[PDB]
């Protein structure tokens, strides 16, 4: 079976079709499973700033380059195109680290996540997680400072957002935007988050090992 | 707990007790296991005594020592089995709790299936934190296949006379077998298994890195 009953929106899909070129739609039509979407993001070059800005799905399809939220927004678009809600989840760190965004999806009542990253951490999640919490917690141990010895190995994840439904915005605002979508990032950051720790628990945390920081440092793209 | 500790003290040498006395937090225990050389197996199943003597351990050997150290400071000596398909080997950790939250001490040579901080609200939640990083990384044949299938209830070693495992000179294969036979909870059904996606090449490369050469 492949169908489009994932509680997205026929009306919403119609609005998307009005905005997209034939080429864009032909691509999105092929990306009919979460797995196919992740496979597609694997062929996109991970970004650098070798401007460096928060591109729309349109820009990403044109230039075949993406950082995490650019990847997740394209994924959410592709999920919506096949009848899922376009859902983002923010993973919120201390100010020592950058947040990471994934695109949530469900298959047979279980949560998965599509993720664009250059490192072997914060990757795709299979639809096997019984709750958003359970999925989010599967990231905690592998979210740490690996790029400097300053707080080397410190675990930096502090909270996860409720699923963030992009349906609330006019699709023009993000799908095909030419501006900076920093307002969208900001709206995500400002949405309901659930803390993972209290102060006591934070004091318990143990740094990741040297082998872990070395492993995390590996790069998919030069 | 106090009674159990007393029984352990009867069995242990002064040197062994001096070591266990130092390992007074789960974090200190993990730090200690980090100084023990990881194995690379003919196969063994050494007691905590043997492990302290030879300073060498595979995963269950590490977890049994951890459980001992936890018990010496009044925690239950709990193991959790992580059970894979036939394509992979199981992994064992020592569970612990601090302020109502589960953590895990783990002995491994690779940057996966590591220590877990006491932040997980249930055994299930902790176990699920291992799923994505349990995969075939050593061959191209089913490269990246995710192999974890079930986790055990906490396995309390209190059910056995401590003589039987703490200081045993025999093979503790019976203990491994008892663990493997205890209540397990499946993570997938057949439908979910069909959804699984292989880990990426970058992930298998990362998993292949070694702490001990
Ligand atoms: Zn479709
Ligand atoms: Zn954020």
Author numbering:
A (entry chain A): -8 to 41, 44 to 215
B (entry chain B): 0 to 40, 44 to 215
Sentences from the paper on this structure:
Here, we present the structural and functional elucidation of CPR-C4, a hypothetical protein from the genome of a thermophilic Candidate Phyla Radiation organism, identified through metagenomic sequencing. The function of CPR-C4 as a cysteine protease was predicted through remote structural similarity to the Homo sapiens vasohibins and subsequently confirmed experimentally with fluorescence-based activity assays. Furthermore, detailed structural and sequence alignment analysis enabled identification of a noncanonical cysteine-histidine-leucine(carbonyl) catalytic triad. In all crystal forms, the structure of CPR-C4 is a homodimer displaying a mixed αβ fold, with a central curved antiparallel β-sheet surrounded by short α-helices connected by flexible loops.
The CPR-C4 protein, including an N-terminal His6-tag, crystallized in two space groups with different crystal morphologies but similar resolution limits. X-ray fluorescence scans identified an unambiguous Zn signal from crystal form 1, and the subsequent X-ray absorption edge scan was used to select appropriate wavelengths for data collection, optimizing the collection of an anomalous Zn signal for multiple wavelength anomalous diffraction phasing. It should be noted that these crystals were grown using protein expressed without the addition of Zn to media. The crystals diffracted to a maximum resolution of 2.60 Å in P3221, with two protein chains generating the functional dimer showing two-fold rotational noncrystallographic symmetry and two Zn2+ ions in the asymmetric unit. The structure solution was nontrivial: model building after Zn substructure solution with SHELXD required data processed with autoPROC using STARANISO. The density for chain A, which was built first, was notably better defined so that even the side chains of the His6-tag were interpretable. Interface and assembly analysis of the form 1 CPR-C4 dimer with PISA showed an interface area of 1669.1 Å2 (15%) and a binding energy of −26.2 kcal mol−1. Surprisingly, the two Zn2+ ions were only present in crystal form 1 and were both found to interact with the same chain (chain A), in a tetrahedral geometry, as is most common for Zn2+ coordination. However, the absence of other metal cations in the zinc-free crystal structures implies this is not a promiscuous site, and the tetrahedral ligand arrangement is strongly preferable for Zn2+ binding over other transition metal cations or the sodium and potassium present in the buffers used. The TSA experiments show that Zn2+ instead plays a stabilizing structural role, increasing the thermotolerance of the protein significantly.
